[PDB]
Structures are given as structure tokens and as C-alpha cells.
């Protein structure tokens, strides 16, 4: 092990004693991967064991199974779960794989050499050695590109991902014409993050998703080769801190942003996160309620078209500021919502009361009714309900869990970026420990006021 | 002794023993702080563990009843008791522990013993400070907490009908007390509470900014990453640079403390001032003298229906809180409100 | 010397009365923009239809209101989270009626506070100071972001965002508890502990140092030199190190505010606080009410009142 | 001739604090004063 007397780092900063220990650092990272793979496998098998075919996955508080279901495994027409053995296979595979990674980490943390540069030059690396650092980034960049292409392969081959917008009903579909038009693929990137544009969260077609992964997959592999055969340019070296903590701070900041984006994706996107498995989105639940009553009242004998509300802005239907006909009520804020159950009734100009008056299919109703009841609203003790509700329902939208968890994760990792980045910059300057007590810069600065 | 030499007395004996280096400073104040505090906190535990408010508030408030840490609470006595001190030997319990607990006697026991405990604690602060020969600024600062307790747990309850309308010793109980004040007293609009909130938020800002500044202007007095190791308990030089700190805040915020004394005096003045301000506001609520609403806007809203402000909106909310909790929050009133009489908005 | 270099120096100049920086280059204009509109709005802004129900709430000192009641009405519900730049509005009058100023102020304000955090580190690096003062300033910035951005987004409208006013702040807090029971959220509990504790620590630390330096000497060197340590009530050695004490003085408040901010963000995703309504049941099934149930009774009142005419359906899923 | 005779002392910061306080207090109670 190590002691503070020889490192200057206390036990609460012990892992910081592994910065220059390449061999030990390898074991630490490899081991941590084992933990991640372990949970993926363990929790998956736990979910499979606690899964029941009489209830939707979202009602069973399952988060991992929805991911496999979206990949198009053990799912059928309407999102109905045919079998769960595929899910069991995934858990078993990850769990056993975690053992291999665990052994490697333990070895590279005990028997393995504390450093590798002395023995294995290829693995041997020193922070600041930009060339080597860029090469390492390249290798991992290629790996991520291959992973994205594996998804693209599963979409156009080896079966297909589940398409909630599939024609004549939602089910797994083999993407055959993935969007490769740069304008469409990169359009999302330049889209405003505000309402309507929804930036990249707006992606509603699997064709763009698979096509976008095609673009990112290629660029990452090409970028890896570039970083493998190129060294940072003068401008970069003069505008970046070359240190392990600095490199970590860059990753911390990036992963923190990715966390926030993932939170929004799980809360707004319904394509990449099928509402059939992940449950309805906040906007989806609201629109579903308006549709549920609109249908019920219309059947009772109410003209939803000319039904003035208390404010006079239409009880069931109204016009979006843009002009599109939208459901009335506070759901006006979610007028930009788009779901496979509501699209058929829509048309060039907002909703089509013709479809609403006649052509409303029973499933369009049943689905909306189910979504309305299973809204994302919930409590920490898992007491399902808008609020001020009695303890009767035990359900919290999986979307809520992912959105809340990843948001908090992103926030902390951003704070970690600020901590590591600032310390890295201060370390480079040399004032990380504190003031010289003899070269205090302020004492040499202008007396200001 | 006594600048004259006097014969030692039993007091001198007891004095030296009480005022004697001991695992904990007993002193003379301890004779009040130790016993009262033990009974107060002990009573709160016993109450939250196995005591019910089924006959005082008709509510289950005990772990034995199945309540959790947040829900469990020592509820106040029934409003029928009014301002009765409710002693175990009182004309109510008449020396019946079971009934004394059922009548809500433990609440008065905890409050009374706790109140004297706080007095003993402040006296301990003066005692220890006098022995250390240091100005008792800490004791003067402890006046704000005591003032809050007296105004919220004594003055207010006394100004109202009875101890029933006093903060019950419980997490959820304090929460309902807070909500009650907004619905009935509009505590938020009260200017004194506003000054109090400013003090608590301001003190928190001062505490955080001071710790960050000092821990970030520290001098390099060590050769290791861990800066905490580089400090001597009996060091004379300041561990951090007041100058560097002054310039940073002078340029970042435009103003900055230049006297460490003034800085710390300000750190203790802000919080104490705020608490005392809020205490005066609670005194007004005790007599129902509250800044509930501005008549000028009330008259305008009545004459001009369209006119509306967040102030008018908050008034309506308070109206709902009072009508949709009075039936249970105040069982003595025995108010059965037909659902039609209750104020409900469109839908919902 | 290259003029751009000359400019770069002036920007990083520490001789400036108020240190300007690359962060300030964006912070100064953004905050100046937000301050100007806020002052004009809080004074002459016409009524705004925040609920998007064609019912405009009056604001600004000119249109009645007051210092306490006055506030900047949040954007209309109709706009929701849609970007509403002045140029998108057909007429400045429409921009005011729809509640555009609020969105503009918040956008030019959040950027400024984030740049303010970066400016803090910039000067610290220029002065040669440690780089974690901004981390402490991250706690307040995180809270502001949640009330003016994260929550508005989670709910799906800028109208949900806390109004820029005293009375508006109170309204935001009340409705929030009525729909999220923030009081029963463990994270908000941590935040209250942070502020209540921070005030306690501030009062004690201030009193100890004041009584000590009462006279450059260490904050407590005086009392330490006498050796009459108050271990009588301060029987501990954890904070014997001044650096250790000051660290805690910063960690306790900042970490608490971080939790309360995250708590608000989680509740923005409909993750309400503990719900123990009708949790205690007797033998035959009769519900034994508790303090929680009483809190629920109040929450119901605020709920049935909030947006008296802005609900056409029973469930408030929005 | 009272030796106890002394003089009050107001510094720039003290003056600023006082004026700031008297103004802030007015801004806070002005609304209530005009009710």
C-alpha cells in the first residue's frame, strides 16, 4: 500500500497516490469496470427474478429490462413481453464477465507492477507525454466507434430495435434505410435546446437514430486514427493544461454534461425510450388525460369543438400560439408532444376534430387511459400519485428515477470538474499548496484603492 | 480570599467540587442544565416511543402506534386544558401518570424542563467564560435561540387560546405549525420574518464565504498535498493571507473586510439580529396582530375585478389552507363544513 | 506590441478596481442587460398572462403593486419552454403581454452568475490563490438554476419558474409544497439543516474569535497562548486545526445547499417527498390520522386554490 | 470642565452602513407604512 508520510496525501485522498502508479492505476480502473459490469449483470438477474408478466415493466420498477426490450429482445406486437430468457442471458453474461475484469483489476492492484513504463513500454505512459496520451485516446475512440456500429448492425441485421412508431402497430423493425443526410443528422445538433426544437431530444424516427450512430461511429474511429497518428498542435499545447488531474477534469466536465442530456432524453424522448416499457412521459400523461375526458364527454354528448371553458379558451381543444389546433387546458404547454397513439388523429394543422369525432380507435383510448393513470408523478417512498394522495398505489415512473438520478450525477460530476480543473491549473502554476509567505503576489501588485 | 481573607464555608467546598476539572464541566449551572435537559430530551424520546395523542389531537404520534421518526411527535395538550401548566399532580391528571400522558402532560413537562435547560445552558456559557476569563459573547449570542423558543413555544401559545396552538415536539408537527402560520397569519408577508430569513441566509453566506476564503488564501506552511497537516495549534502567524483575501473580494465583489475582528463580529451579529427580529414578529402573531394583507390593493381588487397580483393570489391560497384543515387541525371547534361550502377552484 | 495582446492584458489586468476577465467579458454585458430590463420591468411593465388563460396579472410599481407585491411575472404558459426572443414577438407590446422580459432577464442572469463563478477562479489564479472559492459559490448558483431553469423545464413551462418578486417567491414556495411536499423531502431537510447549522456555526465562530482577538495573531492564538481552552464545553480536538475548522465552516453550508438544490431538481421531475398519508391503520382497517395527514389537509387546500381557472381536468399531471 | 467629556467617532464604512441600513429598512417598511 502507501502512507501519507511518503505521498503527502491523506487516506481520504489515497486514490490520488495512484496518479504516477500506472500499473496500480490500471488495476483500479479495471476493477471499477468489474463493479459496473457486476451491477449490470446482478441487477438484470434481480429484475428478471422480480419480473411478473401480468404487469408492464414500468409498473414493476424495472430500469435495465426496458433497455434490452428497446434493443428488440423478448418483445412482441404492442410491446407485449413474449419471453424473458434473453434478459436472463444478458445478466448471466455480464455477471460472469465482471469476474474476469475483477480478477484483472485485483492482479494489477496487488501482484501486477505499480508502474508499466519500465517493463511494458506500450502500456507505459507519463502524463504530459501528449503523443502517448493522444494515442491512448485514439485506441478508446476507435473502441466507442465499434460499439456504436454494433448497435447499427443490430438495427439493420441480427434482428432489429423495437419501433414504437412502426406502421400498422408498434413492434421491432429492422432499419433498412438509416438517415445518412448530414443536414438531417447534424440538424439536431444546431437545433435550439428550447421548446419545439428540443435539440437532439427531438429525434422521433429510428432511421435518424441509427443513421446518427453511423455518423458518430465513423467519426470516432477516424478521430481515433487521427489522434493515434497526430500530436497536439502548438495552439492546443498553449491553451490546455497537460496533467492527469487536468485530463480527468476534462472528462468530468464532459461526462457531467452527458448526464444532464441523458436526464432530458429519459424525461422527454419517447422513441429511444419506448413509453411501452419506460411508461408515459410527463407531457404524454397530460395529453392522455385531456384525450381521455374529451373522448368520454364526447360519447356522453358534448361538442368538444364548440365547448368554451371557464376562461373562454376552449375546454377540450384550442389553438397553439403558432396556430396548430391543440388540446385545451394547462396541457397547452405540452402542445409540442408527439406520441404514436395521437399522431394518427393529427393532421397538417394540429389535431383533426374529424378523427376526434369519428375514427378514434379503441387502442388510442385504452393506451391514453393507461398512460394517464401511470403518470411520472410519484413520491420517494414510491407512493404513486400526483400529490396529496393516500398511500394506495406503489409506483414511481422509471423515467422519473433515471431523470432525477442522472441529473444529480451530472451536477456532482460538474462540481468535480470545477474542483479537479481548478486544482490542476493551480498545481501547474505551483500555488496549489498555498502562498509562498515570501513571494505573495498581492504584496507586489498595485495598492488598488 | 475575597480581597480580605475569609473563613472557608461549605459553599467554598461545594464551589470547588462543582467548579472542578472533570470529564465534563459540572459547575453550579450544571445543577439546572444537566437535570432539566435530561428530563426534557428523555421525555421527548419516551413520548415519541410509546405515547398517543388520540385523546388530545385524535392523531397517532408514537412508534408503538406505527409512526416513523418523521411522523412521531410529542403533541400539545388539548385546547380544553387552555393555558393550564398541567402538572402530574395538577387538577387534571390528579396524580395519574397514564392519564397525565393521555392528557398530553408530557408536552408541558418537556417544554418547561427544556425552557429551564436553555436558561441553565446560557448560564453555563457565562460560568465557563468567567473561569476562562473571556468576554461571554457566545452566551450573548445564545440569547437569539432562547428568544425564538420563548416567543414561539410560550408567548404565542399564551397569546392564543391554549398550549394546543403551540409547536408540538415533532418533525411533521413543526411542519404543520409552519403551514398553519402561512394560512392564518401569513407569516411570509410579515416584515419581521423577512428580516429573520435575511439573517439566516446571510449568516449561512458568511459562514461558507469565510471558510472558503480562509481555506483558499492559506499560506504554504507545509511540503505535502494535505494543507491541514501544515498547521500548529500554538502558531502565532495567521495561517491565511488577509491581504490576498481583501484584494480578491475588493475586485470580485467591490467591497471586502479589512479587520478580522469586525469580520467575526459581523459573523455573529447578522444571525443574532435576524432571530430577534423574527421573535418580535411572532409576538405580534400571538396577539393576531399580523401583516395579513394590504387594504389598498384589497379595495382596488374588489372595485376592479380584473386587477390581480401575486399578493391577491397568495390571499386565496391562505383561504384554502384555513378551510381545508380547520376541521381536523382544530377539533375543539367541531366544525363540519359541507363540501359545497369549502372553496374549490375549477376542476381539481 | 500587438493591440489584441495589449487588449488581452487590460482584460487580465489585476490593477483594475473590479478585476475584469474573459468570463467578465460575457458576464458584464449579460448582467448589465438583465439588470436594465429588470429595473424597467419592475417599474413600468404592463400586465402579463402568466397562466396563458387570457387573465393578465398586474405588475410593476406604475401598474399599482408595491415593493413587496411587485414582481416580474413569469413567461405565459402558452409559450411554455419555447424560446421567445423580442424579434420573434410581432410587437414589443405583445412581448410584454406574453411575459417575454422574464425569459430575457433569466437567460441574461443565469449566464452572468455562471460567468461570475468563472471570474472568481480567474482572479484566484491571477492572485495565486487556491481555486475552490467558486465551488462554494456553486451552491447558491445551483439553487438559482433549479428555481429559474431546471424546475421550469421539468414542469414544461417558464411560468412554473419562480417569479422575480417578493410575493411571487412566496407564491412559488407555497404551490411547490402543495404539489411536491418539499417539507417532507429529505434533501430540503438537509438544506434547512445547512442554513440553521451555518447560522449556529457562524454565531459561535464569530463569538470565539471576537472574544479571543478582543485584545495578525492567529484567529485564536490569544486564547491558545493562555491555554485556557474552553474544552469544558468544547471537549474535542477535531477542529483544533484552524484550517480544519474553516473547512467545516464552508463544507457544512455549501454541501447542504447542494442537496436542497438537487432535491428541488428531483422534485422538478415529479419525485415528491415522503408520502405517509393513511400509513397508520387500526385492526379493522380504520385509518388513524397522523401529523402527516394534517399536513396533507393543508396541501389539498393550496392545491384546490392554485390556478382557480387554469384547470379543466381533475388530475394536475402538468 | 468635566474630564468625562469625549467625542463621538463616525468612519466612512460606519456612515455607509448607517445610510444603507436606514434606506433598506425604509424600502422594507415603506410598502406596509402606505398599506
Amino acid at each position: 500500500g502507501r502512507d501519507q508520510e511518503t505521498t503527502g496525501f491523506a487516506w481520504w485522498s489515497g486514490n490520488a497516490r495512484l496518479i504516477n502508479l500506472s500499473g496500480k492505476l490500471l488495476g483500479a480502473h479495471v476493477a471499477h469496470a468489474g463493479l459496473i459490469v457486476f451491477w449490470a449483470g446482478a441487477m438484470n438477474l434481480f429484475e428478471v427474478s422480480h419480473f411478473v408478466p401480468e404487469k408492464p415493466m414500468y409498473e414493476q420498477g424495472l430500469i435495465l429490462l426496458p433497455h434490452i426490450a428497446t434493443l428488440g429482445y423478448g418483445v412482441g406486437p404492442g410491446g407485449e413481453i413474449i419471453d424473458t430468457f434473453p434478459y436472463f442471458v444478458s445478466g448471466v453474461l455480464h455477471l460472469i464477465s465482471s469476474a474476469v475484469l475483477g480478477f484483472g483489476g485485483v492482479y494489477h492492484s496487488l501482484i501486477g507492477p505499480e508502474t508499466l513504463e519500465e517493463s511494458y513500454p506500450f502500456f507505459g505512459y507519463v502524463w504530459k507525454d501528449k503523443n502517448k496520451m493522444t494515442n491512448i485516446l485514439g485506441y478508446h475512440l476507435i473502441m466507442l466507434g465499434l460499439g456504436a456500429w454494433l448497435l447499427v448492425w443490430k438495427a439493420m441485421y441480427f434482428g432489429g430495435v423495437y419501433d414504437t412508431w412502426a406502421p400498422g402497430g408498434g413492434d421491432v423493425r429492422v432499419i433498412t434505410n438509416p438517415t445518412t443526410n448530414a443536414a438531417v443528422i447534424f440538424g439536431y445538433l444546431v437545433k435550439s435546446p428550447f421548446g419545439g426544437d428540443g435539440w437532439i431530444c427531438s429525434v422521433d424516427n429510428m432511421e435518424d437514430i441509427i443513421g446518427g450512430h453511423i455518423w458518430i461511429g465513423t467519426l470516432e474511429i477516424l478521430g481515433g486514427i487521427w489522434h493515434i497518428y497526430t500530436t497536439p498542435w502548438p495552439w492546443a499545447r498553449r491553451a490546455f493544461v497537460w496533467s492527469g488531474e487536468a485530463y480527468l477534469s476534462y472528462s468530468l466536465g464532459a461526462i457531467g454534461v452527458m448526464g444532464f442530456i441523458a436526464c432530458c432524453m429519459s424525461w422527454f424522448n419517447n422513441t429511444a425510450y419506448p413509453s411501452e416499457f419506460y411508461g408515459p412521459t410527463g407531457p404524454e400523461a397530460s395529453q392522455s388525460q385531456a384525450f381521455t375526458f374529451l373522448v368520454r364527454d364526447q360519447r356522453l354528448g358534448a361538442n368538444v369543438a364548440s365547448a368554451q371553458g371557464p376562461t373562454g379558451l376552449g375546454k377540450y381543444l384550442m389553438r397553439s400560439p403558432t396556430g396548430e389546433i391543440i388540446f385545451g387546458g394547462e396541457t397547452m404547454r405540452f402542445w409540442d408532444f408527439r406520441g404514436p397513439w395521437l399522431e394518427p388523429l393529427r393532421g397538417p394543422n394540429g389535431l383533426d376534430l374529424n378523427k376526434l369525432k369519428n375514427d378514434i380507435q379503441p387502442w388510442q383510448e385504452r393506451r391514453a387511459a393507461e398512460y394517464m393513470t401511470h403518470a411520472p408523478l410519484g413520491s420517494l417512498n414510491s407512493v404513486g400519485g400526483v400529490a396529496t394522495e393516500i398511500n394506495a398505489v406503489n409506483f414511481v415512473s422509471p423515467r422519473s428515477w433515471l431523470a432525477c438520478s442522472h441529473f444529480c450525477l451530472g451536477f456532482f460530476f460538474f462540481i468535480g470538474h470545477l474542483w479537479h480543473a481548478g486544482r490542476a491549473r493551480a498545481a501547474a502554476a505551483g500555488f496549489e499548496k498555498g502562498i509562498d509567505r515570501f513571494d505573495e503576489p498581492v504584496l507586489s501588485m498595485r495598492p488598488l484603492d | 480570599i475575597g480581597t480580605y481573607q475569609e473563613k472557608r464555608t461549605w459553599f467554598d467546598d461545594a464551589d470547588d467540587w462543582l467548579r472542578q476539572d472533570r470529564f465534563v464541566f459540572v459547575g453550579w449551572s450544571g445543577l439546572l442544565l444537566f437535570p432539566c435537559a435530561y428530563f426534557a430530551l428523555g421525555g421527548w424520546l419516551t413520548g415519541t416511543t410509546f405515547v398517543t395523542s388520540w385523546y388530545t389531537h385524535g392523531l397517532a404520534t408514537s412508534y408503538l402506534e406505527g409512526c416513523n421518526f418523521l411522523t412521531a411527535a410529542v403533541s400539545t395538550p388539548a385546547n380544553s386544558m387552555a393555558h393550564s401548566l398541567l402538572f402530574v399532580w395538577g387538577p387534571e391528571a390528579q396524580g395519574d401518570f397514564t392519564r397525565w400522558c393521555q392528557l398530553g402532560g408530557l408536552w408541558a413537562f418537556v417544554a418547561l424542563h427544556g425552557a429551564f435547560g436553555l436558561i441553565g445552558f446560557m448560564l453555563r456559557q457565562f460560568e465557563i467564560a468567567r473561569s476562562v476569563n473571556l468576554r461571554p459573547y457566545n452566551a450573548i449570542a445564545f440569547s437569539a435561540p432562547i428568544a425564538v423558543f420563548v416567543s414561539v413555544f410560550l408567548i404565542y401559545p399564551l397569546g392564543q387560546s391554549g398550549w394546543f396552538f403551540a409547536p408540538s415536539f415533532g418533525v411533521a408537527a413543526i411542519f404543520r405549525f409552519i403551514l398553519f402560520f402561512q394560512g392564518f397569519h401569513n407569516w411570509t408577508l410579515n416584515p419581521f420574518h423577512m428580516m429573520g430569513v435575511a439573517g439566516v441566509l446571510g449568516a449561512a453566506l458568511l459562514c461558507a464565504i469565510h471558510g472558503a476564503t480562509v481555506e483558499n488564501t492559506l499560506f504554504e506552511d507545509g511540503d505535502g498535498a494535505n494543507t491541514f497537516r501544515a498547521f500548529n495549534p500554538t502558531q502565532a502567524e495567521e495561517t491565511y493571507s488577509m491581504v490576498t483575501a481583501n484584494r480578491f473580494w475588493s475586485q470580485i465583489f467591490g467591497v471586502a473586510f479589512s479587520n478580522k475582528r469586525w469580520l467575526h463580529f459581523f459573523m455573529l451579529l447578522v444571525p443574532v439580529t435576524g432571530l430577534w427580529m423574527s421573535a418580535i414578529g411572532v409576538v405580534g402573531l400571538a396577539l393576531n396582530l399580523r401583516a395579513y394583507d394590504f387594504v389598498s390593493q384589497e379595495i382596488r381588487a374588489a372595485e376592479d375585478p380584473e386587477f390581480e397580483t401575486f399578493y391577491t393570489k397568495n390571499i386565496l391560497l391562505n383561504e384554502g389552507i384555513r378551510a381545508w384543515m380547520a376541521a381536523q387541525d382544530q377539533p375543539h371547534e367541531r366544525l363540519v363544513f359541507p363540501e359545497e361550502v369549502l372553496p374549490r377552484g375549477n376542476a381539481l | 506590441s500587438s493591440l489584441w495582446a495589449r487588449f488581452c492584458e487590460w482584460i487580465t489586468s489585476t490593477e483594475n478596481r473590479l478585476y475584469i476577465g474573459w468570463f467578465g467579458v460575457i458576464m458584464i454585458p449579460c448582467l448589465l442587460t438583465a439588470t436594465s430590463v429588470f429595473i424597467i420591468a419592475f417599474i413600468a411593465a404592463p400586465p402579463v398572462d402568466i397562466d396563458g388563460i387570457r387573465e393578465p396579472v398586474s405588475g410593476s410599481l406604475l401598474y399599482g403593486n408595491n415593493i413587496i407585491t411587485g414582481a416580474v411575472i413569469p413567461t405565459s404558459n402558452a409559450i411554455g419552454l419555447h424560446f421567445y426572443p423580442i424579434w420573434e414577438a410581432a410587437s414589443l407590446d405583445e412581448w410584454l403581454y406574453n411575459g417575454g422580459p422574464y425569459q430575457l432577464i433569466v437567460c441574461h442572469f443565469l449566464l452572468g452568475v455562471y460567468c461570475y463563478m468563472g471570474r472568481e477562479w480567474e482572479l484566484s489564479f491571477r492572485l495565486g490563490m487556491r481555486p475552490w472559492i467558486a465551488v462554494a459559490y456553486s451552491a447558491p448558483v445551483a439553487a438559482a438554476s433549479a428555481v429559474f431553469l431546471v424546475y421550469p423545464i421539468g414542469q414544461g413551462s417558464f411560468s412554473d419558474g419562480m417569479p422575480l418578486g417578493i410575493s411571487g417567491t412566496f407564491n412559488f414556495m407555497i404551490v411547490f409544497q402543495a404539489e411536491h411536499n418539499i417539507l417532507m423531502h429529505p434533501f430540503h431537510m438537509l438544506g434547512v439543516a445547512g442554513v440553521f447549522g451555518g447560522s449556529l456555526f457562524s454565531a459561535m465562530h464569530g463569538s470565539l474569535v471576537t472574544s479571543s482577538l478582543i485584545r495578525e495573531e492567529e484567529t485564536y492564538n490569544i486564547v491558545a497562548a493562555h491555554g485556557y481552552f474552553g474544552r469544558l464545553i468544547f471537549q474535542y480536538a477535531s477542529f483544533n486545526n484552524s484550517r480544519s475548522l474553516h473547512f467545516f465552516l464552508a463544507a457544512w453550508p455549501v454541501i447542504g445547499i447542494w442537496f436542497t438544490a438537487l432535491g428541488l431538481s428531483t422534485m422538478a421531475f415529479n419525485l415528491n417527498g415522503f408520502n405517509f398519508n393513511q400509513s397508520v391503520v387500526d385492526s379493522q382497517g380504520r385509518v388513524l390520522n397522523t401529523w402527516a395527514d394534517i399536513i396533507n389537509r393543508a396541501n389539498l387546500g393550496m392545491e384546490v386554490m392554485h390556478e382557480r381557472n387554469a384547470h379543466n381536468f381533475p388530475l394536475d399531471l402538468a | 470642565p468635566n474630564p468625562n467629556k469625549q467625542v463621538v467617532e463616525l468612519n466612512r464604512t460606519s456612515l455607509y452602513w448607517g445610510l444603507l441600513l436606514i434606506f433598506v429598512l425604509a424600502v422594507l417598511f415603506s410598502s406596509y407604512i402606505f398599506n
Binding site: 488598488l448 484603492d449 | 488577509m242 491581504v243 481583501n246 475588493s250 467591490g254 467591497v255 471586502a256 479589512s258 479587520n259 | 478596481r17 473590479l18 417599474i43 410599481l61 406604475l62 408595491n66 415593493i67 495578525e216 | 468612519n11 466612512r12 464604512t13 455607509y16 445610510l19 444603507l20 434606506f23 433598506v24 425604509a26 424600502v27 415603506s30 410598502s31 402606505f34
Partner: peptide, 30 residues
């Protein structure tokens, strides 16, 4: 004119803050 009074108070407070930052006593003390 209550609004005029309120505006005066707000403006006055800001003015005090201004001089407190630019016309403040030179910080000769650390």
C-alpha cells in the same frame, strides 16, 4: 406618487452601494 417614493428609495439604496464601492475609504489596513 407612492411608486415615485418607492423608486426614490430603491434608487437611493443603489446610490449608497455605488459610493460604498468606488468612493469607499482606501483600504490602507490589510
Amino acid at each position: 406618487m407612492e411608486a415615485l417614493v418607492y423608486t426614490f428609495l430603491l434608487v437611493g439604496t443603489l446610490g449608497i452601494i455605488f459610493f460604498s464601492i468606488f468612493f469607499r475609504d482606501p483600504p490602507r489596513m490589510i
